Design a protein around this ligand. Structure first.
Ligand SMILES: NC[C@H](c1ccccc1)c1ccc(Cl)cc1
Lengths: 20, 337
C-alpha cells in the first residue's frame, strides 16, 4: 500500500528546508 | 468588503514595514526552560518572561551560522515581516533583539505543538478536519499575498495548533516582500512548485501549489510526491502525474487537481478570480469564512492542555548552551535587526 511505502521511507520525520 | 478589510490591513502593515521595531527586550529578561526544536537553520526554546510570567517560543539564530548558510537577507526579511504583520492565524512576534553572538525572536507559544506531530501519530485527518485547517491557510495567504508577501515554506512542521484548536503559521525564514517575480531556490522538497524546481522566476502561485500538497497530506496521511531522496521527489513533482487515495471525495480530488496544476494559467489562486476560485469551490461549500476568521467555529480537535509551560506535545531535543561572545560578530550584516 502507499501508506506502507511512506512509513517505510526515510522521510516520515520532520523535513528540513533546502537552499542553494 | 474583504477588499476594504485588506486595504486597512495594508495601511497597518506599511507603517511597521517602513519603521520596524528594534531591540525591544534582552535575553536576561527571560528564563530558559526547554528546547522545542532545532536545525541548521536555528533553534527554538520555551522561555518564561519574568515581568509577566508569560511563556514564549524564543527563536535563537547564531549570526555566524546564518552568514555561512547565506541567510542574512532572508533573516532580515523574517524579522521585518513578522514585526509588521497582524492576523489571527499568524504567530505573533512579541519581542526581538540581538547580542554579540545571536539573534532573538520571541514568538507566542502554542503548547498544542506542531500539526506535524498530531498528523503523523493519528495517521490522517478526516476531510472536514483537513478543511478546517485549510480554510485558515486560505485566509492567511489571502492576507499575506495582499501585502505582497510570499510565504514559501508551508508544511505541517510550520503550523502550530493553539489552545482553541486553531492554526498558527510559524517560521517566516523564507518569507519575502516582492512585487513581481523572484528566483531563490528555497522551500521543502515535498512542497516545491514545479517552477521552483525548474529554476524559473516564480510568484505567489507557489504558495497555492503548497496548499495543494498540505491538503493532500493532511487528508491522505502522506504527501502526493514522496521518495527517499529529494531528486526522486522532484522527478515526481514535474512529471505532471498525481494519484489520490480511493477515500478522497470527488470535490477534494477536483480542488487538488486545480491546486497541484503545473500550468500557471490554470492553477487556482493564480487565475483572474484570485482566491475566490478556492473560497467558492464545492469542497469549501460548508465553510463559513467569516466564522473561521472570527474563530466561532468549533475546532475538530483540541490539544490536551496541562498548563501554559507544558512541553508534552513537543519532542525532546538535546539542550545546548546559549553562549554569547565578548566580541561582537557580524555587526554590519545584522545592523538593521
Ligand atoms: N517549525 C516550527 C518549530 C517550532 C516553532 C515554535 C515553537 C516550537 C517549535 C521550529 C522552529 C524553528 C526551529 Cl530552528 C525549530 C523548530
Amino acid at each position: 500500500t502507499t501508506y506502507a511505502d511512506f512509513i517505510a521511507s526515510g522521510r516520515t520525520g520532520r523535513r528540513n528546508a533546502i537552499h542553494d | 468588503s474583504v477588499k476594504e478589510f485588506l486595504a486597512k490591513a495594508k495601511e497597518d502593515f506599511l507603517k511597521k514595514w517602513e519603521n520596524p521595531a528594534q531591540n525591544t527586550a534582552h535575553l536576561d529578561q527571560f528564563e530558559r526552560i526547554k528546547t522545542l526544536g532545532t536545525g541548521s537553520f536555528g533553534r527554538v526554546m520555551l522561555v518564561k518572561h519574568m515581568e509577566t510570567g508569560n511563556h514564549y517560543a524564543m527563536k535563537i539564530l547564531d549570526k555566524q551560522k546564518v552568514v555561512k548558510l547565506k541567510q542574512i537577507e532572508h533573516t532580515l526579511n523574517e524579522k521585518r515581516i513578522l514585526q509588521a504583520v497582524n492576523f489571527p492565524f499568524l504567530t505573533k512576534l512579541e519581542f526581538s533583539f540581538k547580542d554579540n553572538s545571536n539573534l532573538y525572536m520571541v514568538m507566542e507559544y502554542a503548547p498544542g505543538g506542531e500539526m506535524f506531530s498530531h498528523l503523523r501519530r493519528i495517521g490522517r485527518f478526516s476531510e472536514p478536519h483537513a478543511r478546517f485547517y485549510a480554510a485558515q491557510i486560505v485566509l492567511t495567504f489571502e492576507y499575506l499575498h495582499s501585502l505582497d508577501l510570499i510565504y514559501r515554506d508551508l508544511k505541517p512542521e510550520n503550523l502550530m495548533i493553539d489552545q482553541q484548536g486553531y492554526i498558527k503559521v510559524t517560521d517566516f525564514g523564507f518569507a519575502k516582500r516582492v512585487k513581481g517575480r523572484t528566483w531563490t531556490l528555497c522551500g521543502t522538497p515535498e512542497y516545491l512548485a514545479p517552477e521552483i524546481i525548474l529554476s524559473k522566476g516564480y510568484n505567489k502561485a507557489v504558495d497555492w501549489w503548497a496548499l495543494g500538497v498540505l491538503i493532500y497530506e493532511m487528508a491522505a496521511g502522506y504527501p502526493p510526491f514522496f521518495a527517499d531522496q529529494p531528486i526522486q521527489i522532484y522527478e515526481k513533482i514535474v512529471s505532471g502525474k498525481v494519484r489520490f487515495p480511493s477515500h478522497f471525495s470527488s470535490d477534494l480530488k477536483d480542488l487538488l487537481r486545480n491546486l497541484l496544476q503545473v500550468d500557471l494559467t490554470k492553477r487556482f489562486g493564480n487565475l483572474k478570480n484570485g482566491v475566490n476560485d478556492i473560497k467558492n469551490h464545492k469542497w469549501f461549500a460548508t465553510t463559513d469564512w467569516i466564522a473561521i476568521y472570527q474563530r466561532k467555529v468549533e475546532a475538530p480537535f483540541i490539544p490536551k492542555f496541562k498548563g501554559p509551560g507544558d512541553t508534552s506535545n513537543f519532542d525532546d531535543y538535546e539542550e545546548e548552551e546559549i553562549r554569547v561572545s565578548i566580541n561582537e560578530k557580524c555587526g554590519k550584516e545584522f545592523s538593521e535587526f
